Design a protein around this ligand. Structure first.
Ligand SMILES: NC(=O)CC[C@H](N)C(=O)O
Ligand SMILES: [Mg+2]
Lengths: 408, 485, 92
């Protein structure tokens, strides 16, 4: 039946690290963004990031999970050069979030993918494998991470791709992360097992790694492993267990012959006092979740009369969605606003590598230019010459076809 | 080497009344060490150059009549367990030989602010694991009352330095009794405050849920003075208690008429020697003559202190010592080619024998299939042990008993027999398990070796402990003996 | 029990080099100690909650305010093997 389950890690956009006051944003110079806590110096102690906790529960609630009341941290013990303490501070028994779910569209049907948990932890450093030795840089060590483990409810690489696409979108709306696989702020590990319909459904497992991007690899992983999983069903394979993905060659090289199963010796972290998440706290955070994509697309189509395609493009990021909602409530025509956002504005962001918010256009000036258009005092032509500047330095459009020589 | 036997309290008034200057004080302290420590061997790294420099600053402040600080000009020795910025901190291990911290521990920051003078680091059992200090990688500290006897452990250097008149104050750490037991063996005063009373930031970790820094002194008053200086909430330690009141001296001097003292029958069990038992029984009578109501109670889960303590502490230690891999600091093996080798060789060569035992025990206790039957089980026993105290504290103000089952034993007599070494922790571990404050004062001698009397209090009630200990100290102490040795 | 295999398994878990002799020694110690630990079976823990923290203290959090890291020089100070401002280790 092809039962799949995803294991995702998200990097939180906090100012400081999870258990240390070090900057969560580092430069190019290695080991320049650390302190005695990140260096696991003897005698140091962890100090939990308040915002990371709120953001973690924010994401968890956006995923409709039940939030824990009593929640502590545990040590996940294991030696490795990018894990200086020889243990990652994480959550074992009491994850901050449990049993959520995400709905997605597949073959015109609405399928619900349950999500087992969302827990907090810290990131490891980086070891640049170069030469007969490896160089370890700990600027990234300690950065906040939330692990989101899906229930094994997805049934194909088709759905799995749709799953992480919906997930990525919801987390982007919470503002807790940029969630771009490209930049590392979003990561994913799969878990696949095949087996005939109507079973204990124990088709073993296939923890495959090296999946680096949505559209990319992980989207073709399953195509292959099921493939193998089936062609090898005419034998009852050693089940296999964990295999890496080879990009160009593109396929599961069954990487490691398990030792047995790594013993992390998980135990409650005595250095961190337990969290007691009261109702007021939950509600406070619950109140920071904005209106999500599905809800907004529904309104755009059913209420603003916008085309479904437009609704989809406009809600790909909260920022554009917000700008669109403000611009229209500023008098601008709905469709013309959608067109300028999907078109001109988007062209700008691309051929300039800039976030819509860093530019200078505002729902107000854009609405102003849109009015100069639907009035006629400005043709689509002049509009193309004014928008560029209006974006960068502008403020008034019926001031540029003026402060410039392109007039009405 | 003339104010070398002066108390903290009296040494401070001498400096304030300008009877002597900070520099002369420091000179005296070093003459003492150079003349006495070659035999006692309580110190590891000395910080003389810096000490004199600081003493110069203080002479000037003395002249300008601006002597601030609870410990202005007072000399201090610190267990090489406690990180001292810029000064070699080894935990008495090869693994950290030559290690020079790039940060300051909270207690030192607090002590430096009170203007105390850092004299040097004190010897201890390697990574604080032991009961005689004999596991030290550098030297074997000896008992000032009998150079053939151990000074106790793991803070042997802290207790010995104070007993041998090298400093009027030292800092030790207590995970399973490492402040109290050495204080008992060397005949001095040692307080392990309430878990959460003193910051653990800068304390090389043994067992995170049990560790606690505390002072050792030649008298009760001084001890309370040092505690006031190092206690307090700390943003660097999330488990430090937000308790504002750090006044531990205001009750010292008041009587104990009607004080309800509990004497657990288990604290006088078969594991306790007759001389120790006899000494504590006389102490009980001394308490009654002062007006205290001493009655027998029961702490039924006492017998499980040693077993559960060793399982829990070793388990935590097996994780707390995992950072030592020689990659970012400390001992790095040379003949290592493999990464697996870098870890295994650096650790097997940098760690002493006892440390590795604890690590093996702890690693095993937390491993798959054994986790519940060992570690978690022991964590449940800890609950029972704490429950014993809460029930007793419903009707009594304090608990009393012997600090250790015996007097100090001989060097070489128990260092090759672990189970016998462990048994010495019978009366101290229950206190760390329950997170309670506990102080030890001398209550007698047997064959010249001091016997410790222990007072265990309610959480954050060190003031009451200091009040009862002082009262008892007026009746019996060793204040006049140290000078004779 | 405590077999040479378990001892070696533990050794590998704690990343400790153990010689084909210290194994039989660590085995006896591990057995003697663990046996000594079975005294806890006499402790009536059925239904009792485990103690993880002795001090009741809730939600001690730190404001998400970044503090510049220490100079790379400081971070490398106490390390024995360093190269390119990074810690140097074997490649396995
Ligand atoms: N560090 C001290 O509190 C020592 C506790 C005990 N004697 C041991 O070896 O674990
Ligand atoms: Mg993880």
């Amino acid at each position: 039946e092809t039962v799949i389950g995803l294991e995702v890690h998200v990097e939180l956009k906090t100012d400081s690290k999870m258990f240390s006051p070090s900057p969560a944003h580092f430069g190019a110079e290695p080991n320049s963004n650390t302190n005695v806590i990140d260096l696991a110096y003897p005698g140091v102690l962890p100090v939990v990031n308040k915002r990371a906790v709120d953001w973690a529960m924010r994401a968890a609630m956006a995923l409709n999970m039940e939030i824990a009341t009593e929640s502590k941290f545990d040590r996940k013990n294991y030696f490795y050069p990018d894990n200086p303490k020889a243990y990652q501070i994480s959550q074992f028994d009491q994850p901050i979030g449990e049993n959520g779910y995400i709905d997605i569209e597949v073959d015109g049907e609405t399928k619900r993918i349950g999500i087992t948990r969302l827990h907090m932890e810290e990131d490891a450093g980086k070891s640049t494998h170069k030469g007969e030795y490896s160089l370890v840089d700990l600027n990234r060590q300690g950065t906040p991470l939330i692990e989101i483990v899906s229930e094994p409810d997805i049934r194909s690489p088709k759905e799995a791709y749709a799953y992480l696409e919906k997930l990525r979108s919801i987390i982007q709306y919470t503002g807790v992360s940029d969630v771009k696989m490209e930049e590392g702020s979003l990561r994913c590990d799969a878990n696949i097992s095949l087996r005939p319909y109507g079973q204990e459904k124990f088709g073993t497992k296939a923890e495959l790694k090296n999946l680096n991007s949505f559209n990319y690899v992980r989207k073709g992983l399953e195509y292959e492993e099921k493939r193998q999983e089936e062609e090898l069903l005419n034998g009852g394979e050693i089940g296999q267990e964990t295999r890496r993905f080879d990009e160009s060659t593109g396929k599961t090289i069954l990487m490691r012959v398990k030792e047995g199963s790594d013993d992390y010796r998980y135990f409650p972290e005595p250095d961190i006092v337990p969290l007691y998440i009261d109702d007021a706290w939950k509600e406070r955070v619950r109140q920071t979740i904005p209106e999500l994509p599905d809800e907004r697309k529904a309104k755009y189509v059913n209420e603003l009369g916008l085309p479904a395609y437009d609704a989809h493009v406009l809600t790909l990021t909260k920022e554009m969605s917000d700008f669109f909602e403000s611009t229209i409530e500023h008098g601008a025509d709905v469709k013309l606003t959608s067109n300028w956002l999907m078109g001109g504005v988007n062209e700008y962001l691309n051929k300039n590598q800039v976030e819509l918010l860093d530019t200078k256009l505002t729902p107000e000036n854009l609405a102003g230019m849109i009015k100069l258009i639907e009035d006629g005092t400005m043709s689509s032509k002049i509009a193309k010459k004014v928008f560029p500047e209006l974006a960068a330095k502008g403020g008034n459009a019926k001031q540029i076809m003026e402060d410039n020589g392109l007039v009405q | 080497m003339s104010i070398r036997y002066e108390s903290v309290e009296n040494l401070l008034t001498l400096i304030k009344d300008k009877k002597i200057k900070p520099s002369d004080v420091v000179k005296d302290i070093y003459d003492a060490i150079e003349e006495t420590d070659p035999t006692i061997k309580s110190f590891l790294a000395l910080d003389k150059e810096n000490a004199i420099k600081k003493a110069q600053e203080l002479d000037e402040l003395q002249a300008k009549d601006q002597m601030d600080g609870k410990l202005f000009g007072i000399p201090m020795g610190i267990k090489d367990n406690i990180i001292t910025n810029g000064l070699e901190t080894t935990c008495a291990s090869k693994m950290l030989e030559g290690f020079v911290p790039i940060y300051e521990s909270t207690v030192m920051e607090k002590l430096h602010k009170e203007n105390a003078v850092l004299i040097g680091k004190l010897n201890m059992d390697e990574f604080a694991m032991g009961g005689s200090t004999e596991t030290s990688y550098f030297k074997k500290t000896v008992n000032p009352f009998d150079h053939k006897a151990v000074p106790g452990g793991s803070s042997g250097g802290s207790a010995a330095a104070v007993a041998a008149g090298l400093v009027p104050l030292s800092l030790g750490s207590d995970t399973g009794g490492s402040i109290r037991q050495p204080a008992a063996y060397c005949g001095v005063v040692g307080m392990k405050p309430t878990y959460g009373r003193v910051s653990r930031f800068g304390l090389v970790a043994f067992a995170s849920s049990l560790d606690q820094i505390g002072p050792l002194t030649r008298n009760v008053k001084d001890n309370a003075i040092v505690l006031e200086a190092i206690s307090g909430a700390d943003v660097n330690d999330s488990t430090s208690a937000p308790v504002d009141d750090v006044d531990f001296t205001s009750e010292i001097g008041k009587d104990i008429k009607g004080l309800k003292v509990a004497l657990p029958k288990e604290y006088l069990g078969e594991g306790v020697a007759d001389d120790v038992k006899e000494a504590v029984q006389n102490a009980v009578e001394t308490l009654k003559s002062l007006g205290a109501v001493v009655e027998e109670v029961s702490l039924p889960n006492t017998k499980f202190g040693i077993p559960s303590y060793y399982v829990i502490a070793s388990s935590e230690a097996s994780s707390n010592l995992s950072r030592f891999d020689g990659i970012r600091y400390g001992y790095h093996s040379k003949e290592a080619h493999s990464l697996e080798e870098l870890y295994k060789m650096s650790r097997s060569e940098g760690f002493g024998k006892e440390v590795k035992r604890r690590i093996f025990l702890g690693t095993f206790a937390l491993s798959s299939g054994y986790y519940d039957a060992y570690y978690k089980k022991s964590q449940k026993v800890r609950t029972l042990i704490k429950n014993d105290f809460d029930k007793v504290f419903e009707n009594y103000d304090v608990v009393v008993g012997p600090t250790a089952p015996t007097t100090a034993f001989n060097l070489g007599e128990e260092i090759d027999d672990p189970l016998t070494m462990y048994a010495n922790d019978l009366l101290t571990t229950p206190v760390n398990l329950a997170g309670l404050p506990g102080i030890s004062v001398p209550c007698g001698q047997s064959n010249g070796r001091p016997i410790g009397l222990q007072f265990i209090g309610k959480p954050f009630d060190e003031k009451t402990l200091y009040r009862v200990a002082y009262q008892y100290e007026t009746q019996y102490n060793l204040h006049d003996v140290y000078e004779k040795l | 029990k405590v077999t040479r295999e378990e001892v070696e398994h533990i050794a590998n878990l704690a990343r400790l080099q153990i010689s084909p002799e210290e194994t039989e020694e660590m085995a006896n110690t591990l057995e003697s100690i663990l046996d000594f630990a079975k005294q806890n079976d006499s402790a009536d823990t059925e239904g009792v909650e485990p103690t993880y923290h002795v001090l009741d203290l809730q939600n001690v959090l730190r404001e998400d305010k970044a503090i510049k890291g220490i100079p790379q020089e400081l971070a490398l100070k106490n390390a024995k093997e360093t190269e390119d401002g990074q810690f140097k280790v074997p490649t396995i």
